[PDB]
Design a protein around this ligand. Structure first.
Ligand code: IV2
Ligand code: IV2
Lengths: 149, 149
């Protein structure tokens, strides 16, 4: 069920880790800066995400998070089906890679407005989700999920 | 425009601060634990919120946040109209008070499942937004905003 499918994406900048969840059908994202991509951090991020949107399936970003007992506990708690993130579809790699490049571009454009990286990352989330491409990612996720209800 | 109206709410537990944003028309919430309710914390919370939902108007929770230059900078950045939160409607007090009591109840019911308060708070956000009252708050916010688009 495509309205409920999200993909985890971990990228790096300034020696820090940016964890992104992408709503695959819309391109809508949520993101956070973390010190390191641990099971505990990923678990907490997923718990927050699933309290905010109806997350049914998550394609995890790597095998360590797929294996993590803490990540599995969070997915159990929150009613999330944890899946691998193997791009059986090859264009899935390229779409994420492109989004990572785009996000890093936006972060660069705002970086001086922000004292801390986490502020710049949330500015980038804002700009990404509002950008009209015609509809915005925010508009698309709401339409997709409303129709599903 | 009722689809875009949110209310800030600050409550306390275990000597810590829980900052809540309520989508007034739906009862949907986002929340975070912070060390203290500063302008900087409130500003960052609003930036995150407005990157995730179309926040047009925020009724701030007190006069210090209403006055804060950092909160005003975030509202300017994110396109949010900052208003006072004076309950011209007297039932507004009681609805927030009730939600605070309900949230604290849920936190108590999950508290032992969570090592840290922040995990319990996000479990409570999850339970609150999914609770069927008949529709859930999550269902209502999406319907309200989809109709508005
Ligand atoms: C900007 C935006 C977000 Cl971030 C999320 C949902 C919606 S619905 C709409 N018209 N705009 C949005
Ligand atoms: C559980 C939930 C949330 Cl937290 C937010 C939006 C929606 S729409 C739907 N059917 N469920 C939800």
């Amino acid at each position: 069920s495509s309205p409920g499918i999200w993909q985890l994406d971990c990228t790096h900048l300034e020696g820090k880790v940016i964890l992104v969840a992408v709503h695959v059908a819309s391109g809508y994202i949520e993101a956070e800066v973390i010190p390191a991509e641990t099971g505990q951090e990923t678990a907490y991020f997923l718990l927050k995400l699933a309290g905010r949107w109806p997350v049914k399936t998550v394609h995890t970003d790597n095998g360590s998070n797929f294996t993590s007992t803490t990540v599995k506990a969070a997915c159990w708690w929150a009613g999330i089906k944890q899946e691998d993130g193997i791009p059986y579809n090859p264009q899935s790699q390229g779409v994420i890679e492109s989004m990572n490049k785009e996000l890093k571009k936006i972060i660069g454009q705002v970086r001086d407005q922000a004292e801390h990286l986490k502020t710049a990352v949330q500015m980038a989330v804002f700009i990404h989700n509002h950008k009209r491409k015609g509809y915005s990612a925010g508009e698309r996720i709401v339409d997709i999920i409303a129709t599903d209800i």
